[PDB]
Design a protein around this ligand. Structure first.
Ligand SMILES: [Cl-]
Ligand SMILES: [Cl-]
Ligand SMILES: [Cl-]
Ligand SMILES: [Mg+2]
Ligand SMILES: [Mg+2]
Ligand SMILES: [Mg+2]
Lengths: 459, 459, 459
């Protein structure tokens, strides 16, 4: 009897799992919302600088209307290589945002110290790929909480806590090509291996080098470390980048996983839309919503409040035609990156509606218990939309100057709804509904144009 | 000089051949119609129970409008495994219908006894895959006739004879997980290998076990058996599941093979339609036509009558917009599973037209020489439509409660055109065109709702 | 740590490079236009006879509206095999036209003699594939010039010179299965290896056989010859048919390469159109423009004139809705194969506009310095359009009796604009705008129907 080759099967469940970390794929936790869980780990936050500028350039006539296609190709070529390194070193990519990604090595506490070494090595080999746009890496380690929120058809997750705040702080101090360790990371790490320099007015440190002792063999050490990695591809599957590539059909699991992915992506996965339809440079309105709490590291407090805000946000977005693209913790608060005008989702008066939706969200969320401040930034223009990452691990994301602008507005103008000039001028709303604002110097924004507060219909 | 790898070529002829058995692919018989041929073999009829119930469940809100996609994934995952086993054991899959399939091992008479052993083993290994919805297996052996019928643009085939009737009888007696042998099968088989129990009021037997003698080696025995298998992948091609995967372009052959496949499938094969467009849960009307003959095992009699009925059926289906999905022998007669509303084929007043088409077919077929009785069942509702099977061997098929209902109506209400309540109520026809019928208890139907005879315009 | 398999990456740059020779892919020359360069090499011109007749036959009812799909399948099956041989023997396929292709082995002068041997062998192994429609092969060797012309969004190239004229002359003398050598080829070749017969009234010769001396080993000789082949896949990439399959994203390079490929092809490459949409048998109008010069072998003279004509042609084609499918040197002159009605490009009054565009091109090009004669043939009917070649090397092309007719009209009726009867009769133009022409016997045309000169609006 023959023993024919088994072909890779690219079932819809496997395709869906590309869009999600192991934390979710193999999580098997309750369908109740909010759901919280607690663990320890090391985080890596990898940022590619210069892609948002490249984004603007890919709109120019030189790209002959194939800007989006060229941008996603060059971005994915570079991001794919980073993803491969993270996965080979045993990390779980949690999320992509723009040209940045966040990865997790979940371990028990006793193994944090060794795993930090692995992650440092990984992070130095990532810098290598590009020594030959810059990459910056922040690392943190310690306690981590996960929150899963949503309704009967949609799910979102995020990670929370001091390590999560730390990893974003660390990445923001990095220069071109630094690997920065949070203070707790530096304190938990194997200091006999790792040569650092202090960072000015900072407790975080910079890695100069990995200097292992005489008898040290990284491959044997890494092997020891795989004992603690639940899903590291092994044995018959050691040629795979993810165990999730072996997932088999299972309707209950697929029903649970699909809730995390946008309907237009599921349409492509189901071979009901061309695989190229979602890469585009298109005019949209970004509504960037930030919620601040008394204590943002405390999942049992903030988890219900986020769920409550979520329930309202999704109902107003449904009505005024928008989508939540991403949710994550910023240095301050839980942020919802919302988009009006995604592929196949393009209402008329998109701008007016973005502004009224923002106001509704603002008024409702301001009265949710435990939410201290709501801030919303609204900006409109041409943004890149597309699936970013590796074949085995990728997500739909948005990149562009107006995305960055909406995020900076919500942080620099807290407690109000602000909009840019495009939104102001193109809205069908009377001028006294706005207030023209003082110009602020904003980290990473060349010249915003005039900014406005959306004051609303009365007062 | 280099010797670069030859890539699998997935020519349109190869894609077309996935939809057909070797019996047709390598048949090279005359284009005249009807065409009949005669041979001997073993048949296996494998039924997956519980898929039509699963079908109903995949319509519920929990599947979030991806019911069809989830159903076809889970069905194909399981059916694919069965197909692989059949193919590795040297069988030719003849046809899929719903969640059931029919396979053939064509051999010369002297080899029936050994080949039965191979098929029994195959059938026990199929039961294995699922011990870890149930599968039931009927086996038969003996004389088999093939009939090919059609016109200049379309071809259909079916198998006929006592073995074919036997294999369906055998499969209907099976409990969850039985392998049942027809009486002739049991009589031709190697009784020193095979432990059976009798079945009550039945000459068919149930296989308890394969108990081979001391010196027996299944792999050596199977090798001996491959001498008699014309198309068993071998040598350079022993890694392939089908020789048909090596078919090369040949316009004359492709013109002959395409006539068996529906135009919408050929559109997908030709990369002119998305590969996901044909998996759907959609409202259709099933018109299930049964023709009974004096002697249904006698191809030279029934073949012309089937061709004559076919010519008329296809002309009325063209006019009132319907398709023949499948044709096969039932316990009694030749059945045409006809469908109104397939993908891209959805007329208005679909129901009225289904009923007038049914009446036309009934009146014409009743006067075809040798057709003793015509019976037609008409039912409408949501049915699963899609390509079922393995990558290398699959077919378009329909599954659902209304498919089963139309088949049961035509068997339990012989000699008339019957319809369900959906059809009755939604037709644009006056009520006295119908007769409300006595309720019958029907094998495999929970509660049909009221049933009607379509009496027609006069009387 | 695992070392997972790297998957073939099928980036858009790689897909674009399939449509272009190495001469362009790895050319890295200036964006100024015209650009000329000069080198030496051997050319092979391979013609498949009988495909244009097959084309007509694939329109018949027997192909059941899948003529185009069947034609492209059978053509590509055969052409692919020829492409593989050319590539394995180290050639660069420059261009496909219809069922013919032109290949280049670029080498330094001292190596012409050995390389001719390699090309002869290649050409005899191509004849072999089909001894088991005919192939004819013309070979030439010597000085070659390349011209690149175009504007800011589009680029075209062609090769020019005595060797290029020679290779077309040689291929036109060939009978079924001859390999013919240009006179210069025969003079530069290793005459101790190659047995020839003279050809009547011709200095070109026919190859009867390769007869290598005792100590000769073709594989060792070929290896020596690879020293001179810049891009021969080797080492880690020796399993590849083209080095271009390893191209990595590079926006500057992709911007330069995409200018050679039609927008509808780039749409398919970008997964924004189904991969089957461009294979069709469709009614179009061919406008075949020939420009003759005093000296057609002299790139520095003719290159500016071609660029000047190009600039005007492309502006009139944009306005009256047409496309340049191909440009190449004929026995006499530079020819532009222009098409009205390509996929997605189908204006109404296509015929009138084809004729006015032809007149505009004629009047303008006649006054370009160095262009001695302009001749334009216009014919309309059903032509095959599609991507022809191998997966790794293919191009969009048109095949059909009306393509051949337009080419023959422009050569047999020099110095005027001519049209066929379909164009004449279907144009919305008055009859005195035409002159009915004497019938000429035209190489390769059965019966043209009446032919007309487009005289134009006055005189
Ligand atoms: Cl997160
Ligand atoms: Cl059958
Ligand atoms: Cl050329
Ligand atoms: Mg960034
Ligand atoms: Mg069944
Ligand atoms: Mg030709």
């Amino acid at each position: 009897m023959n023993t024919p080759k088994e072909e890779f099967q690219d079932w819809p469940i496997v395709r869906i799992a590309a869009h999600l970390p192991d934390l979710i794929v193999y999580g098997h936790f309750s369908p109740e919302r909010p759901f919280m869980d607690y663990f320890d780990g090391v985080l890596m936050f990898v940022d590619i600088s210069g892609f948002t500028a490249m984004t603007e350039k890919f709109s120019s006539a030189m790209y002959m209307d194939r800007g989006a296609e060229q941008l996603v190709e060059i971005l994915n070529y570079h991001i794919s290589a980073i993803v491969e390194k993270v996965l080979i070193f045993g990390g779980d990519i949690l999320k992509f945002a723009g040209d940045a990604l966040l990865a997790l090595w979940r371990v028990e506490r006793k193994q944090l110290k060794n795993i930090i070494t692995v992650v440092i090595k990984c992070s130095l080999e990532i810098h290598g790929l590009f020594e030959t746009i810059r990459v910056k890496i922040g690392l943190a380690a310690g306690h981590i909480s996960m929150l899963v929120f949503g309704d009967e058809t949609h799910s979102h997750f995020l990670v929370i806590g001091q390590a999560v705040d730390d990893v974003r702080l660390a990445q923001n101090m990095a220069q071109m090509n630094d690997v920065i360790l949070s203070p707790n990371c530096w304190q938990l790490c194997d200091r006999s291996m790792i040569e650092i320099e202090s960072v000015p007015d900072q407790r975080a440190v910079k890695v100069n080098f990995l200097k292992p002792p005489p008898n040290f063999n990284f491959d044997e050490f890494f092997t020891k470390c795989t004992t603690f990695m639940h899903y590291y591809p092994s044995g018959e599957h050691k040629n795979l980048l993810r165990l999730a590539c072996t997932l088999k059909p299972d309707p209950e699991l697929e029903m649970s996983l699909q809730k995390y992915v946008m309907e237009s992506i599921l349409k492509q996965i189901d071979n009901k839309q061309l695989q190229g339809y979602l890469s585009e440079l298109r005019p949209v309105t970004i509504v960037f919503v930030n919620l601040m709490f008394e204590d943002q590291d405390k999942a049992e407090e903030i988890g219900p409040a986020i769920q409550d805000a979520y329930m309202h946000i999704t109902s107003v977005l449904k009505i005024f035609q928008g989508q939540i693209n991403k949710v994550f913790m910023f240095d301050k608060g839980c942020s919802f990156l919302c988009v009006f005008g995604f592929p196949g989702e393009k209402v008329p008066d998109e701008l007016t509606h973005a502004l009224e939706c923002a106001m509704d969200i603002f008024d409702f969320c301001s009265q949710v218990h435990k939410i201290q401040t709501v801030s919303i930034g609204v900006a409109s223009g041409i943004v890149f939309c597309g699936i970013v990452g590796h074949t085995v691990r990728h997500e739909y994301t948005v990149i562009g100057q107006k995305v960055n602008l909406a995020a900076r507005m919500m942080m620099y103008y807290p407690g109000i709804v602000t909009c840019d000039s495009v939104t102001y001028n193109g809205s069908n709303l009377p001028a006294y509904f706005f207030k023209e604002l003082p110009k602020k110097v904003m980290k990473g924004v060349a010249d915003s144009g005039p900014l406005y507060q959306y004051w609303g219909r009365t007062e």
